[PDB]
Amino acid sequence: YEPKSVKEIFIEMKDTVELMVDLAYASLLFGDKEIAEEVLELEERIDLLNYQLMMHSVLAARNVKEAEQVITILQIANAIEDISNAAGDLAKMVLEGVELHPVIKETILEGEEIIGKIQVYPESVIVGKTLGELDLATNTGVWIIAVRRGKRWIFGPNENFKIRAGDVLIGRGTRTSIDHLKEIARGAIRVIG
Amino acid sequence: YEPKSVKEIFIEMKDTVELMVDLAYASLLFGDKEIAEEVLELEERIDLLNYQLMMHSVLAARNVKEAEQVITILQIANAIEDISNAAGDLAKMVLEGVELHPVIKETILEGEEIIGKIQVYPESVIVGKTLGELDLATNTGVWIIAVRRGKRWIFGPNENFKIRAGDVLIGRGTRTSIDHLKEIARGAIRVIG
Ligand SMILES: [K+]
Ligand SMILES: [K+]
Ligand SMILES: [K+]
Ligand SMILES: [K+]
C-alpha cells in the first residue's frame, strides 16, 4: 500500500472543502437534497483525510523544530475542518426541508460570485469534449462543480469527464461569465478560446 | 440615514468572507503580515454586518411564519461567521511569525485553485484599464483579490480600480489561468478577449 505524502492529503482537503462550500450553496439555491447529502458525505471524507494528516504529521516529527512545523499543518487543517462543518451546517438546512427566506436564493444568484445552472444543447461546441480539454476554469472563468446527467449526479468531475447534450452543468463564477457559458452551451456562440 | 436591506447586508457578508479566505491563504503563501492584518480587520466588519443582519432580521419578523424564515437567514449568517473566524485563525498564524512547514506554501501553489503574484509591466495592454473594463474574473478566470502598489495595499479593489505599470496583482484561479494572465501582464501576449 503505497505511502501518501502529507501534501497530497492536505491538497485533497483544501480542494474538497472548497467543493463542499460551493455545493452547500448550490443545494440551498436549488433546494436540492441530493446535493446536500453529497456535502455531508464529503464532510466525512474531510474527517478521514484530517485523521490521516494527523497520523502522517505526528510520525514525521522527531525533534522540537519538526514538531513546531508539524503543528502549523495541524492548525490549518483545523481551520479547514471548521469550514467543512460550516458547509455541513448549510446542507443540513436543506435536508431538513426548511422553508428558506427568498433573500437566500437571491443572494446566491446576486453576489460577486454566483452559482449557475447551465443546460447543454445538442448543437453546442462543447458537446463531446472533456473538461480536461475544455478546462473551463482557465478558458472561461466558470468552475464546474457538478453535472446533473439525467437521474445521476457527478460531483467534482475530472478532466476526463466528457460533456453530452442534455447535461446540466452547475457552475461557479461571476454572473457575466455564467451568462457567457450559457450562450456557448446554447450553441449561440460557436466559439470558446 | 437610508435603510439597508437584509439582502445587501447578507451579500456583503458572503462576498467579504470569501475575500477573507483568499487573503488568509495569500498571507500564508507570502508570509505577509499586512495581508494577515487585513483579514482580522475584515473579521470585525463581518461581526458588524452580522449584528446589522440580526437587527434587521429580528424587526422584520412579526408572525410565526416570518420568524421561521428569518431564522434560516440567521443560520446561514452563523455558518458564514464560522468561516470568518476560521480565516482569522489562519491569519493569526502569520501574525505570530510562526515558521511554516514548507508544504503549506506548496499546497497553496499546487491546489486546483491557487494564489498567484502577477507583475504588471509598462508594455502590457491592461495598463491604464480599470478592473471594471477588464473584468478579469469574467474574461480570464483570474479573480483579483488585491493589488500591491508600491508601499500600499488595495484589498478587494472595485471595477473602478485602474491598473498601472509596476502594480503587483494578487490573483486567485487555476494555475494555467494565472500563468496566462502573467504573459498578458508581461506584455508577451498583446491580446485579452
Ligand atoms: K513523532
Ligand atoms: K470550532
Ligand atoms: K419582531
Ligand atoms: K462555532
The single-letter DSSP state of residue B67 is H
Judging by DSSP bridges, how do beta strands B114-119 and A152-155 pair with one another?
unpaired
Helix, strand, coil percent content, chain B, rounded in steps of 5: 60, 15, 30
Q: Which residues contact A175 (CB under 8 A, 6 or more apart)?
A: A109, A110, A114, A116
Q: How many residues in chain A? A: 193
Which of A109, A134, A149 is the C-terminal boundary of a domain? A109
Phi–psi pair at B88, nearest 5 degrees: -60, -40
Are A97 and A119 part of one and the same domain?
no
Quick count: other Cβ atoms within 10 Å of Cβ A75? 17
At B157 the three-state DSSP class reads: coil
C-alpha A183, offset from chain centre: 23
d(CA B100, CA B104): 7
Which of B68, B94, B109 is the C-terminal boundary of a domain? B109
Are A165 and A117 part of one and the same domain?
yes
Contacts A–B by Cβ distance under 8 A: 155
Q: Does B69 touch chain A (CB under 8 A)?
A: yes
**Resolution number, Å:** 2.2
- What separation in Å is there between the alpha carbon of B8 and the centre of ligand 3? 20
C-alpha B16, offset from chain centre: 7
- What separation in Å is there between the alpha carbon of A58 and the centre of ligand 1? 5
Q: Does B74 touch chain A (CB under 8 A)?
A: no
Are A114 and A103 part of one and the same domain?
no
Burial of B19 (0-12, 13-18, 19+ CB in 10 A): buried
Q: How many residues in chain B? A: 193
User: How many folded domains does chain A comprise?
Assistant: 2
Are A33 and A86 part of one and the same domain?
yes
Phi–psi pair at A157, nearest 5 degrees: -70, 145
Contact between B69 and A18 using a beta-carbon 8 Å cutoff? no
Which of B61, B85, B109 is the C-terminal boundary of a domain? B109
Q: Is the dihedral of CA B159, B165, B170, B171 positive or negative?
A: positive
Are A173 and A190 part of one and the same domain?
yes
Are A32 and A42 part of one and the same domain?
yes
Are B5 and B89 part of one and the same domain?
yes
- From residue A190, how far is each of A124, A139, A146, A169, A180 by CA, in Å? 7, 15, 23, 18, 12
Q: Which residue has the cell 515558521?
A: B99
* Strands of B168-173's sheet in order across: B114-119, B168-173, B143-149, B152-155
- What range does the domain containing B22 cover? 1-109
Q: Which residue has the cell 450562450?
A: A183
Burial of B38 (0-12, 13-18, 19+ CB in 10 A): buried
The single-letter DSSP state of residue B163 is P
Contact between A76 and B104 using a beta-carbon 8 Å cutoff? yes
Check which CATH number belongs to the domain holding A45 and give it: 1.20.58.220
Check which CATH number belongs to the domain holding B177 and give it: 3.30.70.1450
Are A100 and A115 part of one and the same domain?
no
Short-list A1, A6, A26, A52, CA closest to A155: A26
Strands (E), chain B: 114-119, 143-149, 152-155, 168-173
Judging by DSSP bridges, how do beta strands B114-119 and B168-173 pair with one another?
antiparallel
Are B125 and B191 part of one and the same domain?
yes
Are A84 and A16 part of one and the same domain?
yes
First to last CA, chain A: 42
Helix B102-110 vs helix A6-29: crossing angle, to nearest 10:
50
Q: Does A178 touch chain B (CB under 8 A)?
A: no
d(CA B76, CA B99): 34
Q: What HEC string does chain A produce?
A: CCCCCHHHHHHHHHHHHHHHHHHHHHHHHCCCHHHHHHHHHHHHHHHHHHHHHHHHHHHHCCCHHHHHHHHHHHHHHHHHHHHHHHHHHHHHHHHCCCCCCHHHHHHHHHCCCEEEEEECCCCCCCCCCEHHHHCHHHHHCCEEEEEEECCEEEECCCCCCECCCCCEEEEEECHHHHHHHHHHHHCCCCCCC
Are A80 and A120 part of one and the same domain?
no
- What separation in Å is there between the alpha carbon of B101 and the centre of ligand 1? 15
Q: Is the dihedral of CA B170, B175, B177, B182 positive or negative?
A: positive
Minimal-distance CA residue of chain A relative to B98: A72
Phi–psi pair at B4, nearest 5 degrees: -90, 155
Minimal-distance CA residue of chain A relative to B83: A83
Short-list A114, A78, A108, A112, CA closest to A94: A108
What determination technique applies here?
X-ray
Are A65 and A122 part of one and the same domain?
no
Write out residues 147-166 of A within 8 Å (CB-CB) of B: none
At B141 the three-state DSSP class reads: coil
- From residue A60, how far is each of A63, A73, B72, B83, B93 by CA, in Å? 9, 12, 44, 29, 21
Which of A103, A140, A142, A158 should we substitute to test contact with B (largest number of B Cβ atoms within 10 Å)? A103
Of the candidates A7, A90, A106, the beta carbon closest to that of B76 is on: A90
First to last CA, chain B: 42
d(CA B104, CA B83): 19
- What separation in Å is there between the alpha carbon of B82 and the centre of ligand 4? 5
